[PDB]
A paper describes a structure:
Images of the isolated S-layer revealed top and side views of S-layer-like two-dimensional sheets displaying a characteristic planar hexagonal symmetry. We used a previously described single-particle cryo-EM data analysis workflow to resolve a global 2.5 Å-resolution structure of the S-layer within the planar two-dimensional lattice. At the sequence level, the [name] protein consists of seven β-strand-rich immunoglobulin (Ig)-like domains (HPI1 to HPI7 from hereon), six of which (HPI2–HPI7) were resolved in our cryo-EM map and revealed an extended arrangement of the [name] protein. The segment comprising the HPI1 domain (residues 19 to 131) was not resolved in our structure, suggesting flexibility in its position with respect to the S-layer lattice. The domains of [name] exhibit a bipartite arrangement, with a long linker (residues 220 to 229) separating HPI1-HPI2 from HPI3-HPI7, suggesting that while the latter domains form the canopy of the S-layer, the former ones form the OM-anchoring stalk of the S-layer. Each monomer spans two hexamers of the S-layer lattice via HPI5, which is arranged as a twofold symmetric bridge linking adjoining hexamers. This extended arrangement partly explains the exceptional stability of the [name] S-layer, since there are large protein:protein interfaces making up the lattice. There are additional gaps between the [name] S-layer hexamers that are even larger (~76 Å), resulting in a relatively holey structure, suggesting that this S-layer is not acting to occlude small molecules from the cell surface. Additionally, the S-layer is stabilized by many salt bridges that form an extensive network through the [name] lattice. Finally, there are two cysteine residues in close proximity (C554 and C666) between HPI5 and HPI6 of each monomer. Although densities connecting these residues were not observed in the map, they could form a putative disulfide bridge connecting HPI5 to HPI6, further interconnecting the lattice.
Numbering used by the authors:
A (entry chain A): 238 to 356
B (entry chain B): 531 to 817, 821 to 948
C (entry chain A): 357 to 633
D (entry chain B): 712 to 817, 821 to 948
E (entry chain A): 416 to 474
F (entry chain A): 238 to 297
């Protein structure tokens, strides 16, 4: 969501933008710079050629029953046995609507061992 | 000898009319058949002899035809070739239109909020649903939250409403074979109460095939949730008129001195306004404290239009008893009846019109509408005639706080 | 080490039609809980909310606060002929044993699905193709009643089989029609030299019929084709040939499809007769 | 070696006996028992709610009934063992997901700490007549008891202490997550997996070697549970 | 509970704009009313006089 | 349990595999890489020649 010359973001149903915030008064200032997303956004993941790549929303395993937070089969965004060097997947921002306005992570697993996160 | 083309079109609107009444077809249809005529000045054909028409393995006659007698798929109206009295063959043939028969409701389910325990009032709930249709495709999806189940006595409203209340909606442009609706609902509950709330997904395909799926959850009132929000005076009135406020919180009032009626014209003076006084509207829920009170605020003031009771009753009766598919010989009439008797035995829904939100310079939460159902009049389905059936019968509002407590108000539509 | 000896939750197979020219679907046939399909069918999972087991809160003092199973890996679909279940020694109970039993007698096996798929596709979608027109692999066989099972497996290979199956049959062959003939039966005043070619006065017509292939879905009930001669509708039996003009005429018939909308496979050629009164 | 998720009645403390049944290759069978105590958790305060359930033939339709924590007789839709490959004669046990909930939980701090439903399992009950025959043989009739080369008192004591039990429930599977029809459903031919070549080769007299009840258990994360089911018409 | 922040942090208010739409344009009853985002799209569809967006409340 | 070309682990009744996990949302991400085992697995221990070797499960 690029910025137009007029001073507002361009019109689109889906998109993303990196935003800085700060909060204070009465508390001491505390800020965050995060990628805000709306609608359905596409993402890309890089990996070595021939590596199995899996992408999850939130959890790879370990459902938290007390907090009513679960991991399901449907939470796999993408999974390919072999990769040519890069992979592309899609995320619907409306998934896990409980976390509107806070961070939620995308988990990437390579070869079943290497795990990375992106909020 | 010339032969004219024939046309078959969808004329069964219950429960919801088809997007394309001459491509996608469902339930009863109307067929008009052509004929054969000899060339002018010719012998004039053998007498009492006419064409016979077929539609994919059935002989068809002009008039009403139940498409449940055929499998779902692509078909064209066919005819035999007949020669004249002198044995001259047919000169020209029309290429009749290609149609699709779909008498199967979409498959719908919930993935999130399943196998459930409890939620607290005021916390957001992730509601995720999936729908698919093999035939003409998914069109419209709506999500509702309901307090009561297996009740059909409309024209009544429990202290917890007791009607499905919309909180999410979605439309698919291209009629894709599958879609997913993901939304968040802010849990609401009566003060100091524990209850079961049913989340319902209503999905329609392009021939007007409709399905409803349900998932139960439990909502417990928060510790702070101890009283319903206070409501000031409210009134529904025509835009050019003036308000006559009344105090009828947690109830729906009949037609007062200022009637509201659906407006089918562009005249802005005939629009309807629902207004709530901001002076009397407060929430007493809170968490002296340490020099600063920990409190709960008002989160939302939403305006709703109730689905017409007569139209909803017709749709419900069709889905429960009348749909021809129920008596179809190529369906499990018991499985279908069980799956509907368990999801369609609900009261008329409430359609989310918008949010009044912050008070204006007149100290009011006000909302403006023409009281025309957004299911009809070309917004979702094309239905114009009989404004009484396709307009809201109640103009209502909900005030909800951060603690999850809520109160409701509204007035019946004069219509 | 961490121990994982339980497979995911059981996946539920579900059937849907495919929207194209050469596919038709019937949901329940003759109250037998059987789905008849021509062309392609779509098999997917109806409950993608399944998770890998065993899950829940860890015992006090554990390395993690929750149990962390190996985690859901894949779903696969298996078509098994119904006749194969005549052997009652095959296992039902102990879902892992059921999965082994299903794998033992599988004939049509789909590739495993690692992802639920895009938004526009169904959850863990696979397509089963049939007939000559379809190019979708794998291809099943006609005139065989198949049980459709789904098996879900986790990252260590622990498998669980569906609590239920689907019943599907395929039919991609249309009906055929037999020949019809008309012969001279009026001898007065003098009999025709050949009743097959020269015809006059009252004649006898025997008409053929249309039947679907043996073991297929069959024709729609109470449906029979109509026959014409020259410019008139003709019924089997005695017919006065004076009702139409002289010349060469042949018996014609309309085409009807079967219950699955399969076009007519083979149609006969009727004899040409001259009418001379 | 196995793991069991402990179950108990709400707000109750009880003794639960774990039994191991072992058979050798001549049909020699033994049972050992060990006792434990199970206490209901703090969160364990109510049995899970159950919706309508019914057992019916696959080609038929359900007629649900509300008989939680009990086993119902033959309703309008009978279930019978299926000895053939005909899939239309299979039996389905179905539970409605709309009425199925657990109220156990631990307002809280803006997020409720709750208990979920863990498992929906389907069981087939061992036939009462066959079990009675086996039990009577192990207790009174086995010739080994009157054998002159055995301690007839030690053997009788060790059996009278382990074989005086009711007919078992055989774990058929798990219904698990609800389907697109909002049901937990399980399919079986109602043939005992002890027999018909699955464990031992016994074919004749289908009445003796088929389940007499089609049952299910719903268990939550707090350890509470409820059970339902229907008698087999046989 | 347990979130990265103690309160929800939406993207935050940006702007306000004013739209003049002829009354006659509302003779088309197919224009959306409900679902305020849909209403905004409908208003943008039939707008004739549009003001510049206002980023500040002003002096 | 090696990975086949098809994208799933090979079929076996007993085996082991080293797996990485991560958990988050709402909590900050935390992950572990562990040896997961199913069925009966064989292990080897190295020691100097002539040394007494004992192996226990859990506690000595």
């Amino acid at each position: 969501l690029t910025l137009t010359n007029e001073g507002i973001v361009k019109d689109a149903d889906n998109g993303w933008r990196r935003l800085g915030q700060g909060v204070s008064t009465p508390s001491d200032p505390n800020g965050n710079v995060d990628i805000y997303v709306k609608g359905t956004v596409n993402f890309s993941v890089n990996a070595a050629a021939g590596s199995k790549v899996e992408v999850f929303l939130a959890r790879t395993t370990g459902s938290d029953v007390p907090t009513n937070d679960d991991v399901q089969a449907g939470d796999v965004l993408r999974s390919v046995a072999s990769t040519s060097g890069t992979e592309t997947f899609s995320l619907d921002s409306r998934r896990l609507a409980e976390f509107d306005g806070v961070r939620k992570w995308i988990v990437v697993r390579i070869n079943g061992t290497q795990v990375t996160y992106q909020p | 000898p010339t032969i004219t083309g024939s046309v078959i079109r969808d004329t069964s609107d219950l429960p919801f009319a088809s997007q394309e009444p001459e491509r996608c077809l469902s339930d009863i249809a109307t067929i008009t058949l052509g004929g054969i005529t000899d060339n002018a000045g010719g012998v004039g054909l053998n007498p009492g002899q006419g064409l016979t028409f077929t539609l994919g393995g059935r002989q068809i006659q002009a008039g009403q035809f139940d498409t449940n007698q055929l499998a779902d798929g692509e078909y064209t109206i066919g005819f035999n070739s007949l020669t004249d009295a002198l044995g001259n063959p047919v000169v020209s043939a029309p290429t009749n239109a290609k149609v699709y028969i779909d008498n199967t409701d979409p498959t719908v389910n919930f993935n999130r909020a399943v196998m459930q325990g409890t939620f607290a009032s005021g916390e957001r709930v992730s509601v995720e649903s999936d729908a698919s249709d093999g035939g003409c495709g998914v069109y419209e999806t709506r999500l509702f939250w309901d307090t009561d189940n297996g009740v059909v006595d409309d024209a009544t409203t429990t202290p917890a409403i007791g009607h499905p209340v919309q909180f999410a909606r979605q439309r698919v442009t291209d009629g894709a074979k599958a879609d997913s609706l993901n939304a968040g609902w802010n849990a609401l509950q009566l003060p100091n109460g524990a209850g079961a709330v049913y989340l319902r997904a209503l999905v329609v395909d392009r021939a007007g095939n409709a399905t409803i799926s349900t998932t139960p959850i439990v909502v417990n009132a928060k510790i702070t949730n101890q009283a319903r929000p206070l409501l000031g005076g409210f009134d529904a009135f025509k835009r050019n008129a003036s308000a006559q406020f009344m105090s009828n919180s947690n109830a729906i009032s009949g037609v007062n001195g200022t009637a509201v009626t659906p407006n089918t014209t562009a005249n802005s003076a005939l629009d309807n306004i629902l207004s709530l006084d901001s002076v009397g509207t407060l929430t007493t829920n809170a968490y002296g404290a340490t020099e600063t009170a920990i409190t709960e605020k008002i989160r939302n003031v939403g305006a709703y239009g109730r689905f017409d009771a007569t139209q909803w009753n017709r749709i419900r009766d069709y889905q429960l008893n009348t749909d021809p598919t129920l008596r179809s010989a190529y369906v499990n009439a018991g499985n279908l009846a069980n799956q509907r008797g368990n999801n369609w035995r609900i009261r008329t829904p409430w359609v989310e019109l918008g949010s009044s939100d912050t008070a204006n310079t007149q100290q009011k939460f006000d909302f403006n509408s023409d009281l025309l159902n957004d299911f009809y009049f070309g917004r979702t389905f094309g239905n114009n005639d009989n404004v009484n059936l396709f307009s809201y019968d109640q103009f209502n509002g909900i005030v909800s706080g951060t603690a999850g407590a809520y109160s409701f108000y509204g007035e019946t539509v004069q219509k | 080490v961490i121990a994982d000896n339980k497979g995911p939750q059981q996946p539920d197979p579900e059937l849907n039609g495919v929207q194209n020219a050469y596919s038709n679907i019937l949901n329940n046939y003759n109250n037998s809980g059987l789905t008849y399909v021509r062309g392609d069918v779509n098999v997917f999972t109806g409950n993608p909310s399944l998770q890998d087991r065993e899950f829940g809160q860890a015992p006090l003092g554990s390395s993690f606060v929750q149990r962390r199973p190996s985690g859901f890996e894949s779903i696969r679909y298996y078509l098994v002929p119904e006749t194969a279940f005549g052997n009652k020694a095959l296992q039902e109970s102990d879902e892992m044993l059921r999965a082994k039993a299903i794998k033992s007698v599988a004939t049509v096996v789909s590739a495993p699905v690692l992802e639920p798929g895009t938004v526009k596709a169904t959850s863990f979608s696979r397509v089963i193709g049939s007939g000559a027109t379809s190019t979708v692999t794998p291809k099943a066989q006609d005139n065989v009643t198949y049980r459709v099972y789904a098996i879900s497996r986790d990252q260590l290979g622990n498998e669980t089989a569906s609590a239920t199956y689907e019943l599907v049959r395929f039919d991609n062959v249309g009906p055929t029609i037999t020949g019809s003939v008309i012969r001279d039966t009026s001898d007065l005043p003098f009999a025709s030299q050949e009743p097959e070619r020269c015809l006059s006065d009252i004649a006898t017509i025997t008409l053929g019929g249309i039947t679907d292939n043996a073991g297929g879905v069959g024709l729609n009930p109470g449906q029979g084709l109509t026959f014409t001669l020259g410019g008139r509708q003709i019924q089997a039996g005695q017919f006065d040939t004076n009702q139409l003009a002289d010349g060469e005429y042949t018996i014609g018939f309309n085409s009807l499809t079967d219950a699955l909308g399969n076009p007519v496979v083979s149609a006969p050629t009727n004899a040409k007769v001259y009418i001379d009164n």
